[PDB]
Design a protein around this ligand. Sequence first.
Ligand SMILES: CCCCCCCCCCCCCCCCC[C@@H](O)O[C@H](CO[C@H](O)CCCCCCCCCCCCCCC)COP(=O)(O)OCC[N+](C)(C)C
Ligand SMILES: CCCCCCCC/C=C\CCCCCCCC(=O)O[C@H](COC(=O)CCCCCCC/C=C/CCCCCCCC)COP(=O)(O)OCCN
Ligand SMILES: CCCCCCCCCCCC(=O)SCCNC(=O)CCNC(=O)[C@H](O)C(C)(C)COP(=O)(O)O
Ligand SMILES: Nc1ncnc2c1ncn2[C@@H]1O[C@H](COP(=O)(O)OP(=O)(O)O)[C@@H](O)[C@H]1O
Lengths: 347, 459, 52, 54, 64, 88, 104, 55, 320, 98
Amino acid sequence: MNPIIYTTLIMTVMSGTMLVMISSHWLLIWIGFEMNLLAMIPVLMKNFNPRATEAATKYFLTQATASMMLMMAIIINLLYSGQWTITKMFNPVAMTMMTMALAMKLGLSPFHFWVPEVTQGISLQAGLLLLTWQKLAPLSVLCQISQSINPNLMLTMAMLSILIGGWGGLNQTQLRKIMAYSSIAHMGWMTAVLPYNTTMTILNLLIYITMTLAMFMLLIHSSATTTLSLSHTWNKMPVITSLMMVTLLSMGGLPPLSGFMPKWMIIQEMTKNESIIMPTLMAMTALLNLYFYMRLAYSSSLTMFPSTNNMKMKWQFEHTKQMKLLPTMIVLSTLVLPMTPALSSLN
Amino acid sequence: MLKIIIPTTMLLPMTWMSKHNMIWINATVHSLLISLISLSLLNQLGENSLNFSLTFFSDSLSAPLLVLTTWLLPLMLMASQSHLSKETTTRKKLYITMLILLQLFLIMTFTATELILFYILFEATLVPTLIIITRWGNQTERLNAGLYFLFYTLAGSLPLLVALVYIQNTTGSLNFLIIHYWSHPLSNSWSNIFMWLACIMAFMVKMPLYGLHLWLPKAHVEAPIAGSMVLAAVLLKLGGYGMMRITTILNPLTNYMAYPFLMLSMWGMIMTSSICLRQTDLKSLIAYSSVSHMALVIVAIMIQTPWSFMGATALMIAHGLTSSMLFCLANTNYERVHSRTMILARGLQTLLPLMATWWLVASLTNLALPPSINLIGELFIITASFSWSNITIILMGMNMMITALYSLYMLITTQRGKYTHHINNIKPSFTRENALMALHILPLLLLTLNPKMILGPLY
Amino acid sequence: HVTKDMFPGPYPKTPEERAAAAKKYNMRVEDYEPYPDDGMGYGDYPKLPDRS
Amino acid sequence: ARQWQPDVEWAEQFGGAVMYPTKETAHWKPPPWNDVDPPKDTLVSNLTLNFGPQ
Amino acid sequence: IRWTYARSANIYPNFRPTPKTSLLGALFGIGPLFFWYYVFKTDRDKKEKLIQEGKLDQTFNISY
Amino acid sequence: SDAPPLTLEAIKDRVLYVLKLYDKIDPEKLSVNSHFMKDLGLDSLDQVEIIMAMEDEFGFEIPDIDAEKLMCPQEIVDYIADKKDVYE
Amino acid sequence: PTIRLQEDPDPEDENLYEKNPDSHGYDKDPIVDLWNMRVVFFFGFSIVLVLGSTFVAYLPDYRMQEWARREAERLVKYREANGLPLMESNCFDPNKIQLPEDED
Amino acid sequence: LLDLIWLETILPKTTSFIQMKMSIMVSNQKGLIKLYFLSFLITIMISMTLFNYHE
Amino acid sequence: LQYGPLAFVLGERTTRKLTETSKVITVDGNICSGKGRLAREIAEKLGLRHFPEAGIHYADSTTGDGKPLDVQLSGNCSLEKFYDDPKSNDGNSYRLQSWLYASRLLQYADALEHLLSTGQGVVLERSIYSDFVFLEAMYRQGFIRKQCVEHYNEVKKVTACEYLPPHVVVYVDVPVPEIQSRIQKKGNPHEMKITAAYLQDIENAYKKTFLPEMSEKCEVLQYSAREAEDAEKVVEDIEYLKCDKGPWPDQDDRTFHRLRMLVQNKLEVLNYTTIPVYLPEITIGAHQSDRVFQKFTELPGRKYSPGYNEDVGDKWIWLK
Amino acid sequence: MPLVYMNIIMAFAIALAGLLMYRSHLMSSLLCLEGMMLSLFIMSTLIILNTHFTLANMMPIILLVFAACEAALGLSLLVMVSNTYGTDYVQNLNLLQC
Ligand SMILES: CCCCCCCCCCCCCCCCC[C@@H](O)O[C@H](CO[C@H](O)CCCCCCCCCCCCCCC)COP(=O)(O)OCC[N+](C)(C)C
Ligand SMILES: CCCCCCCC/C=C\CCCCCCCC(=O)O[C@H](COC(=O)CCCCCCC/C=C/CCCCCCCC)COP(=O)(O)OCCN
Ligand SMILES: CCCCCCCCCCCC(=O)SCCNC(=O)CCNC(=O)[C@H](O)C(C)(C)COP(=O)(O)O
Ligand SMILES: Nc1ncnc2c1ncn2[C@@H]1O[C@H](COP(=O)(O)OP(=O)(O)O)[C@@H](O)[C@H]1O
């Protein structure tokens, strides 16, 4: 792929997302989704191999079905009220269709099956883009129509997402599938609090995006895609493994790290609405994500796995390409808990 | 309160800017100076607490715990510097950083005025301990231990968090002073029962309560010597402290709710004291003895009388000092013979007489010989339990006997008899080990002269 | 220097397993008799005479 | 004595295609080191045509 | 080493839930707790009912 | 999971099943030790056809040099066991 | 190879007394070891233990125990000089207490 | 009997066993879009019936 | 401006520098054949950059100061002890073979970087395409296990697929008895221990696998011992070749850009050399790995990045 | 609602069901996607014509435009899939699991 072509494709993806963000008309939001998918399919296939082709095909099928359901919901809403503005849907059937379509776009359970496969089939850069930037548009649409959310369906999908993310992550040795299941669980956390406080949803999205960017950049810097490949990093760059262990602890929600701030806030917000059982179950379930993060930390930085002889050669060479935003991303992923009240700036 | 927190924070750049051969000296000297500075919080007012600011406050209960933490840091450095000799400079600095962060989190935990900040710091203590255990532990089991030590804790603490925020939604505050002054009775209902359980269970598992204690033998046995010292001396007390702060809003529910926990604590102190009689590992015996003493503390907190609270405070302080000393004593022999089996190295009094004296004094304090503060706390708890119910003495009495039966047993197993013939690498005791033993034991005997310093606010 | 197969294992059922366990504990196979195979956790360890 | 560190046998627990190997996933194979599978011998048949005689 | 390992680590891998094992575990685990609960609850209920009747002879009982 | 751990007994049964399906063989005069040319009175081309049936049954090719040696059902069983690495 | 991996052999522990017959158990370098001993002893036994005990022993009576004793002495003297009971069964004045007007 | 077996059996070992079984059930999929989209159809029907009719 | 996407976007192209004399050339041959002199003479006559055969310490030549490092910090293998004890149970044979393949991969990356950045051609002695013959010999003499061969094939399969084969493959043919005579006349005691079977295995592997495989994508020039001494005829034979066979004519600016992104960034080149396949011969334990890495970081100019080690004379560190 | 509206909505439901239940060929699923788009076009056109929403008359055309893009996208992917396997059967797309 030409660098100019790749830049144009990335700009088209971002401009489709922004068109979704800035539109007041349902047709323009649908157009933004369509443009985003059209430009995003080639990016998944930059490095050509059968696995990338399969991931692109699965992604296209899922997103096209979601787009068709999205348009059907829009058309039913127009039928029952001659309105195109994205304010609040006037038909419960259209609302159910829209909720299911946006859940399929986000990958919430039980529409989660494509996320680990597509993440495993693409490179780490494509995985970073897919798991960070692709969540903005459906979440923005869901935030705009939050007052029309049926709480039962949304909360059921969120709880299923948390549970399934934990259970699926428990079984993985590939790092991309671990990241995908973490994404599913975090998306469940994001959508659990949506019918109550969209500011908490935005804060959770920001924290998750920062930690995911740090994780994927640390995985690109130490070019590992499996657990055993990552077990070799300590013998070449120990600082990377130490920072990765701290970031993994933050992703587990352990205080006083940054990852604790969203869940905490979400929990307290839910208790303001006499929701007690569900936050308790969600936290006890996120314990599973913490468990497999700790397993990765055990294999990567807290113990020293055996290495190979050829590693000596790698001792003689540095990294020619540096990621400029990795240190800031790590610091934001760990030490921003004392700045918690700043969330008032988000509303 | 910043006059203690800020120097503890300054310990970090000071240890990261030192030479490769001067880290231990600087860390020990300035930790001792910080302990001396913290010694000034014992000037308590009686009626109310020392309210430094909106964030921090000191109490007749918090001050001995803070002094114990600050005193335990230099002893931990002294015990650590032996087995870390072959280690690289950067990793040694990282280990010392872990210890300093643990001290900072503990001193901020013991003085926070609101329950949410207390929860945040009380959970933040988990990370340095887990890192220490899993990174500088010696055996392959350490990883498993860490997992236990993590999840057993979190399964207790996550409900509490929910309960905490729930309380602030109905009361409007989680500040301890406001919470105490505006306290209202807890009605008898399922909601109140589950709120009680959520408020109690995290501190229960941190004590640990019998039945929820399986994490402790693993974590204490597989931890390095400093990790074991801090786990036994200070961390186990957190839950105890938490209970004395949280039970002010749980009345009168505690009168009927506390029954299963009291039964578990008494029968489990009997069970763990019996377990100590058949233990092939020397560290496991000390861990189970810690479990028994903390069961006594749990009973004292549950029965909720002024004498019980005084006894609990005294017993927490005494147990911290005694257990840390016992772990250090075991670690000396482990460094000698590279094994934890009790019957491997016998007849050590013949080869190490002063270490045998230290062993005897530690064993005597462990079985609560009067007038040691261990005996003071135990006697106060026993009297309060007798007032609660006259039958309790039976269980209490049994525990006392069994305690001696295992305490002297350990001594008799390791000091008396004849030496093992083929073990020929038992060198004379170093000055460092003797000084560590003395710095453990002298404050213990000194505190007998002024017991009111460690009897808490109910004094 | 005590390797993985020199540690006690599960309860032996075949005669070859019994001979291997007996040699592992430095006993005659005629003299080696483990605890009964209930769930008490004794496993492979020999049941020695109850003398003091 | 020295601290225990993982060896090859300890490391191979994390080398399979999946944790917790069952009987169905025992035949699963880890993906290639680069994300490139070997090409399949799916030979595309040409079309055979009779050009003439009529 | 074999003795220590068998006494400590080899026990759970060789444990089977058995009617004997289950019954002994249930007895030795929960029986004493319920026995002591019954004893203490009986004693304290008797004492509280005695107090409510105005007869305990609690004179000079000012430390608790 | 894949096919169960094929054993010598199943291989022997399959070999006799496909051998008795051959029309030029008396179904009861055939035994595992019977020589094709001598006991069964078959020719070389009949033996080649039997090897084709063997290849069809067990799903793997057999070269000519080896097939010239398989001269009775037991030799076929031994060859299949060696090729499939079966000890019992 | 019949070996599984290339590994360093487990070394034997070194005696600090071998190179330094009076080695204090603090460090391999005799000067650093001696000064570690000196600083530990001076700042633990000499300063924290002796000064700290002395400082704790002479802490001012902020707990108000002598004050309470003198107040009790004054109250007892006054109350037994005027025929009043030494203590009242009521901690607060019943005159400022308004019980519910009806009990049935 | 108690510390090494039954207290181990009830709280930690049962948790590990249950979570391992659930993880094996959840993550062991054949990776065929046919089955996934059949499940999607089932989910759409369930959401359209059990939730959309409750408003 | 370091070369990257931005340099490619505005200006910098590869095809503008190819000038018909690029012609990646490798001069192969058996042990002790005079391929080195022929390679040097070809480079001198055709104006190309010569690459001496990549040894154990080739990586040391291109990093830090060009001086070689200690054997336990670089290579961890010995050719002399391979000649002494080819069947040693410490796995020196396959460790040496894997290290030499890694060195040859790095040298091929360096040569491709030079050619794609300057347009000047390169001459190599051996290559990653012919490194296997020794391996096969090692396997046919019982010096290495089958598992080592499988691991080598995995590494080669994931590494050599990313590069373009050389334009010209020159083979110097010397019979085995002449090779043995040259070895005996050389005088080095360790090479005296080479048996005729090992040399015959190398020759068989060459003649039966390497040349037939390379002839499909490259042009092969075979020369005997006597006719290899005249560099002029070899050079004029190369000068009159038609390079219309392999994948080089199919290369445009974009594939050249991908290749140039790959040939720099030596860590990305060496990525799959250390795949987590645990062969005892090449697996290093955690304690030995830690000790050797700590020893490496204490080298005079290796603690920090090249321009940040003040103990080797780096200045203005606080402003860099 | 007229019975024509119900027929069009049922057509969309049938096309969605046909897409969600896969047979071997991927081309059939692509055709189901196209049918879904056609039913959406018809439904929107009928609503806009009935309500006399003049400016919305350009809405269906835009729909068609993006339909084409989607169609093209699918066909592109199909080509590559066939090139890998010589077939467009969806059971060959199983290299990745959950
Ligand atoms: C090895 C050789 C052994 C033989 C040689 C020994 C020689 C003889 C030694 C025997 C001494 C006999 C002891 C008798 C007691 C005399 C001292 C006593 O009077 O002082 C006590 C005072 O002791 C201190 O108050 C208690 C010690 C303080 C404890 C703090 C330890 C230092 C901090 C280190 C950290 C510890 C961590 C744990 C802390 C919670 C009592 O105070 P008090 O009767 O009221 O005085 C009232 C009058 N005042 C108030 C005006 C002063
Ligand atoms: C190491 C293992 C230790 C684990 C300890 C776990 C113990 C946790 C105790 C219970 C946790 C749930 C408590 C939730 C926080 C309490 C908040 C509260 O009090 O609100 C109650 C809500 O109470 C609940 O909803 C509780 C439901 C329980 C949900 C989760 C069940 C988990 C299992 C509970 C039983 C086990 C408890 C003891 C376990 C001990 C460990 C073995 C009522 O609020 P309202 O909605 O306003 O109603 C009044 C006006 N209508
Ligand atoms: C569908 C319609 C098909 C009909 C068309 C068929 C057309 C094909 C015609 C092919 C003709 C040939 O190839 S001609 C075959 C080539 N020539 C020979 O086979 C004769 C020499 N062989 C011998 O003499 C052997 O000894 C022998 C007697 C075999 C003993 O075999 P055994 O070792 O077992 O004992
Ligand atoms: N891949 C390899 N495996 C083993 N030995 C090698 C390998 N490559 C080069 N050598 C050794 O390098 C030595 C000298 O290299 P060579 O090219 O044969 O002779 P010359 O120095 O005259 O060019 C030889 O002893 C040869 O064995």
